[PDB]
Amino acid sequence: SDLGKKLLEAARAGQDDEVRILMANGADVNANDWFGITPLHLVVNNGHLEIIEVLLKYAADVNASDKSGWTPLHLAAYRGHLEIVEVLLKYGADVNAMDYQGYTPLHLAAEDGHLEIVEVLLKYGADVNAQDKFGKTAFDISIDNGNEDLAEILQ
Amino acid sequence: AKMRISPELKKLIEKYRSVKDTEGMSPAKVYKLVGENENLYLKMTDSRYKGTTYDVEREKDMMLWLEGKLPVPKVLHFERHDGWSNLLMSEADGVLCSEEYEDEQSPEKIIELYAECIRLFHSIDISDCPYTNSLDSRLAELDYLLNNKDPRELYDFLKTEKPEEELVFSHGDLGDSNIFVKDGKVSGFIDLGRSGRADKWYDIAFCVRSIREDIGEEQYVELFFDLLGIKPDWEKIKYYILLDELF
Ligand SMILES: Nc1ncnc2c1ncn2[C@@H]1O[C@H](COP(=O)(O)OP(=O)(O)O)[C@@H](O)[C@H]1O
Ligand SMILES: [Mg+2]
Ligand SMILES: [Mg+2]
């Protein structure tokens, strides 16, 4: 039961205090047992805004990609927490990072229909021309939703 | 030219007729060795499974630790040969439940066999048990088994709160394919690689799931817990099913 494993579990469990204690005692900020998942992915998974900045402060890699190609930014888009996508963008998150289906975070937010996250991704330079692997761009996921909301913010 | 079995072990089983197990579903190769006076079983796993709950060496260690504690096969010989782990063992006493009982159309007996398993496990002192199973060990291993896809459900699972654990002896794959019965009682347990210390709700959750998809009625589940003398914790049971459902 080492520090890495304990840090992953505290991040996973959303125990911010235990994350801070473990980091102070030397735990590896990019620890990943299982699936390329780092503490930053896990804390993003949970929506835990404050602790995200402590981990970046400890030099956490904001663009760490897990074994599905999902970066913390992909995850923040999936979860649809505006506050979290904003902070990850501030800290150098790759807005055009591609997973293994070829999605970028903009692709993931368009699926979930999280609208005021798509604005933010676009201003941070999120190329909408982006095609996934089976071709079907973010436009082709506006139509899956039948949305005169997402399409009508897309010229 | 190169064999996956040592020349010494081949010598030893020469006079048995090998009959590969066509049922079984794990990465292990299993052969029944049919002899004149008895049958043995040979179970073998390749190198990439080393250090996992699928390594037959772990199975072998657990079989040895469980002697006197649970009815299990005897370990006759174990070796490593060219990355492979080979275990030769005795035939379990009795009749594999799933064959000659689950088709005897008496669903109360299945439930009771499972309750009887859980009871047996709860009575075993695990103070010096050589292996322990955790969420982390389970995840790591899943990582490795997939060393050479859609993440949404993984992250949904990881966001879920994990119940505090109460450690008991855990089979880890409790199911009538690994349980043997004889004149009423449990007579044998096989497939022990995933066994060790673990949260008690792990085996119980497996039992609930199996009652649910192979018998299909809530009062049977409610009977299961009457037999156990405990109340269900559906949160704990749900948790471990989800865990095991990450494919
Ligand atoms: N020692 C044994 N005695 C009798 N039958 C056995 C024994 N070991 C294995 N078998 C038979 O082989 C089958 C599968 O072997 P098992 O150890 O359970 O492999 P797996 O890990 O793939 O499920 C069993 O379900 C049983 O029918
Ligand atoms: Mg097995
Ligand atoms: Mg088995």
Strands (E), B46-148: 75-81, 84-90, 95-96
Whether the Cβ atoms of residue B90 and residue B39 lie closer than 8 Å to each other: no
- The residues of B assigned a catalytic role are 173
Give me the phi and psi of B153, to 5 degrees please: -75, -35
Of B143, B150, B162, nearest to A13 by CB-CB distance is B162
- Is B162 in contact with A67 (Cβ distance < 8 A)? no
> Does B247 contact A at CB distance below 8 Å?
no
Domains and CATH numbers, chain B: 1-90 (3.30.200.20), 91-247 (3.90.1200.10)
Atom nearest to B73 CA in ligand 1: 1
Ion ligand 2 residue ranges (Cβ < 5 Å)? B 26, 191
- Structural domain count, chain A: 1
Tell me the C-alpha distance between B187 and B93, whole Å.
Answer: 6
Q: Which amino acid belongs to residue B241?
A: I
Q: What is the DSSP string of B186-198?
A: EEEE---TT-EEE
Tell me the C-alpha distance between A107 and A95, whole Å.
Answer: 11
Two tokens, residue A66: 């897990």
Count how many residues are written for chain A.
155
Domain that holds residue A73: 1-155
Tell me the C-alpha distance between B168 and B142, whole Å.
Answer: 23
Q: What is the DSSP string of A61-125?
A: -TT---TTS--HHHHHHHHT-HHHHHHHHHTT--TT---SS---HHHHHHHHT-HHHHHHHHHTT
- Is A9 in contact with B135 (Cβ distance < 8 A)? yes
For residue B162, list chain A residues with Cβ-Cβ distance below 8 A.
12-13
Chain A's closest residue to B143, CA to CA, is A34
Nearest 10 degrees: CA dihedral of B94, B185, B197, B208?
A: 100
- Is A8 in contact with B159 (Cβ distance < 8 A)? no
Strand order in the sheet with B29-34: B17-20, B29-34, B39-45, B84-90, B75-81
Contacts of A6 (CB under 8 A, 6+ apart): A18, A22, A27
Q: Which amino acid belongs to residue B180?
A: F
Residue B6 Rama label (left phi>0; alpha psi -120 to 50; beta): beta
Contacts of B66 (CB under 8 A, 6+ apart): B72, B124, B189, B192, B195
CA angle A134, A136, A141 (to 5 degrees): 135
Compute the half-sphere exposure of residue B242: CA atoms within 13 Å on the CB side of its CA: 18
H/E element holding B222? Answer: helix B218-228
Question: What 8-state DSSP symbol labels residue B132?
Answer: B
Query: Which CATH number does the domain housing residue A29 bear?
Result: 1.25.40.20
Q: Which residues sit opposite B30 in a β-bridge? A: B43
Cβ–Cβ pairs < 8 A, chains A and B: 41
Question: What 8-state DSSP symbol labels residue B92?
Answer: P
| Deposited resolution, Å | 2.2
Of B142, B149, B155, nearest to A34 by CB-CB distance is B142
